[PDB]
Amino acid sequence: ASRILLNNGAKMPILGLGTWKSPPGQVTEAVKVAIDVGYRHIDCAHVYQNENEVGVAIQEKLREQVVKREELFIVSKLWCTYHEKGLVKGACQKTLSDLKLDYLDLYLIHWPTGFKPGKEFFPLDESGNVVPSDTNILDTWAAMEELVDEGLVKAIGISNFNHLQVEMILNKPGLKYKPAVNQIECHPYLTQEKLIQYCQSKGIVVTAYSPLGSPDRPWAKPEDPSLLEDPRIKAIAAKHNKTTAQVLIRFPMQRNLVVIPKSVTPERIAENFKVFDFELSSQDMTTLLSYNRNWRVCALLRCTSHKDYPFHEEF
Ligand SMILES: NC(=O)c1ccc[n+]([C@@H]2O[C@H](COP(=O)([O-])OP(=O)(O)OC[C@H]3O[C@@H](n4cnc5c(N)ncnc54)[C@H](OP(=O)(O)O)[C@@H]3O)[C@@H](O)[C@H]2O)c1
Ligand SMILES: O=C(O)Cn1ccc(=O)n(Cc2nc3cc(Cl)ccc3s2)c1=O
Numbered sequence: 001a002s003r004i005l006l007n008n009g010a011k012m013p014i015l016g017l018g019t020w021k022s023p024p025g026q027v028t029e030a031v032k033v034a035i036d037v038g039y040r041h042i043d044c045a046h047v048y049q050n051e052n053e054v055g056v057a058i059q060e061k062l063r064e065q066v067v068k069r070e071e072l073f074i075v076s077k078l079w080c081t082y083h084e085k086g087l088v089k090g091a092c093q094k095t096l097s098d099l100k101l102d103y104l105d106l107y108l109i110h111w112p113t114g115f116k117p118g119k120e121f122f123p124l125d126e127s128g129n130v131v132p133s134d135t136n137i138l139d140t141w142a143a144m145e146e147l148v149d150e151g152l153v154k155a156i157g158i159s160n161f162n163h164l165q166v167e168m169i170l171n172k173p174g175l176k177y178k179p180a181v182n183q184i185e186c187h188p189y190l191t192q193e194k195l196i197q198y199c200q201s202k203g204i205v206v207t208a209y210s211p212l213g214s215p216d217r218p219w220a221k222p223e224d225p226s227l228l229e230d231p232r233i234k235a236i237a238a239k240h241n242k243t244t245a246q247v248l249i250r251f252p253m254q255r256n257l258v259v260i261p262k263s264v265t266p267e268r269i270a271e272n273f274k275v276f277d278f279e280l281s282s283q284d285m286t287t288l289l290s291y292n293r294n295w296r297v298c299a300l301l302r303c304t305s306h307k308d309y310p311f312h313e314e315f
Contacts (some may be wrong), residue, residue: 002276004205004258006180008155010105012205014071014253015273016041018262024053028266031057033266035066037273041073043183043260044099045110046091047121051098052075059100073105077159078144081121083114083135086145090154099242107153108183109144111160112137112308122302130302137308141169145176157181159294160298162313163198169278170202183207186252188233189225191292194315199258207258214297216262225295232291236284243271250275251288
């Protein structure tokens with residue numbers, strides 16, 4: 001089945017295209033190729049500073065009659081320097097303008113942390129610590145709720161929230177919309193069993209990011225583990241005459257997750273979508289879950305002092 005039901009009654013494609021680190025010089029072609037081979041879900045963010053080039057591609061394929069807007073599922077995220085309630089609408093509208101759209105299918109609070117407002121996406125002090133803003137999760141959520149009530153987004157959710165931060169929102173007095181999705185890092189070295197268990201039990205769909213372990217992450221160190229190069233996983237893939245990446249994409253799919261692998265290479269974009277023609281066995285799944293090391297690609301330690309830093313909690 002290719003789509004999962006959200007709590008807003010809409011259906012979200014379980015396989016989408018990641019765009020973090022896709023250069024503007026290449027992401028337009030990436031998206032065009034993706035849509036041509038079947039992707040309908042694109043994961044975006046204002047902080048990725050390529051939304052205009054993503055919008056170029058969508059506009060194009062709409063104009064070529066390859067797809068209709070209704071068939072697309074476009075995701076973006078509210079960046080940390082816009083968590084003040086008076087800044088959320090503007091941030092959302094900038095993303096809409098850049099993507100040349102009239103609505104987003106899903107809009108996420110990108111991180112639970114608010115940062116000092118300003119042009120700087122990661123404001124630091126003279127010391128190198130990120131400068132927080134005096135905003136909180138609940139007020140920011142209320143602001144996200146207005147975007148639904150105004151017709152700008154069909155659904156709202158969160159990203160990189162721990163189960164206690166998700167809880168705050170759920171128990172929010174006067175809650176208007178429950179979160180639809182929590183997008184979190186998830187892959188065989190960070191299997192997220194507990195948080196997935198919590199979210200799915202609350203009827204919140206989980207999206208797995210960095211499913212290939214983000215080898216292009218700019219802070220990679222050579223000693224870091226490498227999922228795509230893991231011989232144990234290469235062996236699972238060779239058993240199914242599939243590539244390591246296809247295995248890494250198919251894994252979260254069989255855990256009822258959404259997954260959003262990133263590529264700007266047309267061959268790999270196609271390859272990565274060809275994961276609906278095979279099944280990981282029960283042993284394969286068990287084996288892959290067993291590689292958990294609680295290893296995070298995305299956890300900027302310059303944020304570990306923010307009151308809302310998400311990863312001090314077990315989950
Ligand atoms: N919510 C947030 O905080 C958050 C954080 C991180 C990521 N995300 C989202 O999740 C998406 C995916 O995560 P990610 O970008 O960190 O990394 P990823 O998808 O785990 O890995 C992308 C890397 O894998 C390479 N690659 C892709 N397909 C491959 C294949 N078949 N064989 C070999 N290498 C392949 C890509 O190369 P090329 O592109 O050069 O082909 C790129 O270097 C993002 O782009 C973003 O949309 C969200
Ligand atoms: O955010 C994106 O989708 C991609 N991305 C880009 C740059 C980067 O450093 N990170 C790591 C971060 N860690 C935290 C940790 C916290 Cl608490 C807040 C924000 C971030 S950003 C990152 O994930």
